[PDB]
Amino acid sequence: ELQLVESGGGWVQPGGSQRLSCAASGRIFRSFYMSWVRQAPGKGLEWVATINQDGSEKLYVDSVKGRFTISRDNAKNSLFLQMNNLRVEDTAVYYCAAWSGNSGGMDVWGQGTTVSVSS
Amino acid sequence: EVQLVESGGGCVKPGGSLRLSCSASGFSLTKYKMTWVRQAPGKGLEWVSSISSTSRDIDYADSVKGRFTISRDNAKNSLFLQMSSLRVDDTAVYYCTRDGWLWGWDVRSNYYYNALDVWGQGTCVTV
Amino acid sequence: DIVVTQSPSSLSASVGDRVTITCRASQGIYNSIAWYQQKCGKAPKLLLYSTSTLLSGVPSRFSGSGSGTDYTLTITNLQCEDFATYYCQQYFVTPETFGQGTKLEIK
Amino acid sequence: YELTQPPSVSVSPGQTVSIPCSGDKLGNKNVCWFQHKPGQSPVLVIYEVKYRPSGIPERFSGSNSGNTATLTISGTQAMDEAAYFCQTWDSTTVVFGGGTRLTVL
Amino acid sequence: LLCLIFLLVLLDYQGMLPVCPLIPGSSTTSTGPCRTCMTMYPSCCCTKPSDGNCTCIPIPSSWAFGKFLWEWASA
Amino acid sequence: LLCLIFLLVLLDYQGMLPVCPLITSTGPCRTCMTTAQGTSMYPSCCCTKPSDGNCTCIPIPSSWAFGKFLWEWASA
């Protein structure tokens, strides 16, 4: 199948920046919508971003509108989320998700990276 | 986001020549038939020219037939309209639109006509 | 080569009202009429195509009807955003003739 | 746009339960149900109003009545104890429910 | 074999072989969930992960299989 | 002709020919995926609505779409 692994999540001072990288394990990665969904500690899942196959359609949630930038390297089979001007409420476990063609939702998920934006 | 941005619009002496360059972002021009629509100041919309997906079916309006020259570049993803010998009656805002999606060989009956689904921003040409 | 008359030239209506715009082609275009909305000094946006199909971002208030040569665009509920000029275009055969345009003003 | 779920529901060791999911006109939207066990990545359980992906057991089922989606688990075991989120799109942004931490005694 | 090929060609010319187009990546038609066919001619649809609605494209009425093969061999 | 027939059969087996499963029962319409070459999505359903009917979105078979369609057409 398709396996996604998140990396680059870690502690960062408020107002800082991060670049979470999601490495895929297949060439089918290029054929899927790739989304970032976060789960904050003590809260449920929250969608963050979504990018189409070509990368020409990037969608973000209003909480991280403008602050985050999702972009994919199809040749390298990776999906990066650049977080700029992070906030205290951006502390969460971020998962990359693949909208596979064998399901109507995102049925491929990664382990997740625990971004901890605090002083 | 599907968007078209044209350029090359400005004041031009009568009998001169201008070239309008309409780039597209968010999609590709390779399989779409592109169209030019102008709007004279205080007048209505008017079709100008239309080029097929592979530059085979070129159509010009009877008012601008012979002078204008429409040409696409799918590799560069950009439409172009070379205007030659502009009369004083050619001053208008030109919009580059997207008329029809090709599926199959390049014939007018192999297109899915959605009637100019996305419009450009419009470049003013003043003579 | 197809004369596509559009009527009325201009019409006023209240803030909430149903307004119908008629478009009569010279000859049959076989349900290949499209309705575009052009606001104050902006590029027209496609509202309807194939005489019935709505477009993404278009409010559900706009609707289309008619067949053969006579087609209608109906706005059941109006709003400040509905101040624009509406054009009907036939794309049944080249050249793609547009309508003359109707100016809609909220009274 | 807000999806309203119960904070938690109670299940007998082998009984059937139904996790509801309120919303504004959910009858005209696709609702995907996930399963986020603590410490594990979310697992898609239902990708349409009533359709399950490959490998998900047949016990899960989905329904959408009026403005309320529902995930029904029949013959719930101890391996269904997790948080279930209903996901649907408002205009172009996907929205998850508040979570329904299923409890199996 | 040859008769079968000619029969397939004849069925494809009449539009009886519903080999449907690759749905365009950028379709502006207003839609909704696939279970609500807001568009209807027989169309091939896929659920768009962005807005959650379905993007559809009608089957070509002239040569569906031929057009699909042409577009497959053109890429 | 034999090479063309073999190529068509191979494409049918791989799921490269999205033939509608119509010769009903509504089915899932899975998410859009682009093909190997191109920005166009690969269809997953065959939604069709009659003039006075309902939605019938039957998913496109993956194993043999064209073969299953031909078998259904012959059987009906």
Numbering used by the authors:
A (entry chain H): 1 to 119
B (entry chain C): 1 to 127
C (entry chain D): 1 to 107
D (entry chain L): 2 to 106
E (entry chain A): 88 to 126, 133 to 168
F (entry chain B): 88 to 110, 116 to 168
Quote the study's own text.
Hepatitis B surface antigen (HBsAg), the sole membrane protein on the HBV viral envelope, plays crucial roles in viral attachment to host cells and serves as the target for neutralizing antibodies (NAbs). S-HBsAg is a transmembrane protein with a cytosolic loop (CYL) and an extracellular hydrophilic antigenic loop (AGL) or the “a”-determinant, which contains the B cell epitope recognized by the host adaptive humoral immunity. HBsAg dimer is the basic building block of the viral envelope. Cryo-electron microscopy (Cryo-EM) structures of HBsAg dimers in complex with NAb Fab fragments reveal that the antigenic loop (AGL) of these distinct HBsAg types share a common structural core comprised of four β-strands.
To elucidate the underlying mechanism, we determined the structure of HBsAg in complex with both FabHBC and FabGC1102 to the resolution of 3.09 Å. The structure reveals that one FabGC1102 binds to the opposite side of FabHBC, engaging the lower region of one HBsAg Type A subunit. The epitope recognized by FabGC1102 includes the H2-β1 loop, β2-H3 loop, and H3 of HBsAg subunit A. β2-H3 loop and H3 are bound by CDRH3 and CDRH1, while H2-β1 loop interacts with CDRH1, CDRH3, and CDRL2. Further structural modeling suggests that the epitope recognized by FabGC1102 is also present in HBsAgType B. Additionally, both FabGC1102 and FabH006 can bind to HBsAgType B simultaneously without sterical clashes, consistent with our biochemical results. In contrast, the NAb in Group C (FabGC1102) retains robust binding to HBsAg despite the G145R mutation.
